[model samples]
Target: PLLNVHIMQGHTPAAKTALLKALSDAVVQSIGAPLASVRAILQEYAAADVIVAGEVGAAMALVNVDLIAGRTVELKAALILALNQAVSASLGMDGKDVRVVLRDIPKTDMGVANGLSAMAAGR
Candidate 1:
């Protein structure tokens, strides 16, 4: 499974690394996912490009999760809870500033490692 985070571009490289590590651990601890397989990518947009509350301001995050289907609602909720908390605290931002999105990619279209399907690899 993988997580891609998109947010405003402002912060130290060390902070960036900490946030990624926090997110990766969130997924692993929350859903029992393997640490080695859980991936986290940070995507930062231009300061002028991001808008919050209809204004070009605020530090917010959008977490997009790519994983296989069949997790329970509680599992998903737990992941979201841990993810938001970890990210919010790490970035020194309000809880309302973050949003998380989840999607189960089709096995046929998702792969890794020289041609391994992520959906298949989940097992």
Candidate 2:
């Protein structure tokens, strides 16, 4: 459930076919986070329970992109454009039809293990 994608293409295929490079570019280019720091999880579901556009889609994507807060909407918008291109061009689906929600994660929150606090604390 954390992966949050109702992948209709099955786990194996969806994991293999998921757009890693393209999504990573959004993070790296948009926020300067290195490629080495990126990680992803995915799950696929193809059932009547998953609905789209007032009907059941044979396939669909609900991609949730998370980032540390402070990046402007322009940065997120750029990723949106890139994502739309990647999914549309590769998956043969109208990217606009899919959902891409860029959520901002605040640093210094609980378990915020970004290393700055550790370094400052002499740990």
Candidate 3:
């Protein structure tokens, strides 16, 4: 699993680092994914750079998760729930302020290991 996260700027380095680790742990705990296989990338934006409700935003957190297809609906839901909780706890952000998007990607569709398909490598 991989996460692409976006958040409003101004948080401390400790907060950001903690969020990353928390997200990784959440994936492992919620979905039984390997801890070493989960990767998270975080991007920070200024308040002015993010817009909400057709106006400038005060705070925001967007977490996009891309994972191999075939997880059950319940597992996906659990992944989302776990991720949001981690973000809220680590960033001190309201639960309502965070959004999570889960994307199911087929193993054959993702390329890895020198352009080999994940499916071909039995990943």
Highest TM-score scorer: 3
lDDT of 1 by residue, 53-118 (tens): 887766678888998677789999999999998788778878898998889767766686678886
* Candidate 2, lDDT over the whole model: 0.56
Candidate 2 local lDDT, 4-83, one digit each (tens)? 33345643455346555455555566556656555556555656667776777545766676655666778768766765
Clash totals in order? 0, 1, 0
Ranking according to lDDT, highest score first: 3, 1, 2
For all candidates in order, the CA lDDT equals: 0.83, 0.56, 0.91
Q: Model 1: residues >4 Å from true position, as ranges?
A: 119-122
Q: Candidate 3 on 15-49: residue-level lDDT in tens?
A: 99999999999999999998767999999999888
Per-prediction TM-score to the true structure, in the order listed: 0.87, 0.69, 0.95
TM-score of 1: 0.87
Candidate 2: where are CA atoms >4 Å away? 1-6, 10-15, 110-123
lDDT of 1 at 5: 89
- Estimate the overall C-alpha local distance difference test score of candidate 3: 0.91
Among these predicted structures, which one has the highest lDDT?
Answer: 3
Lowest summed lDDT window (length 10), candidate 1: 114-123
Tell me the TM-score of model 3: 0.95
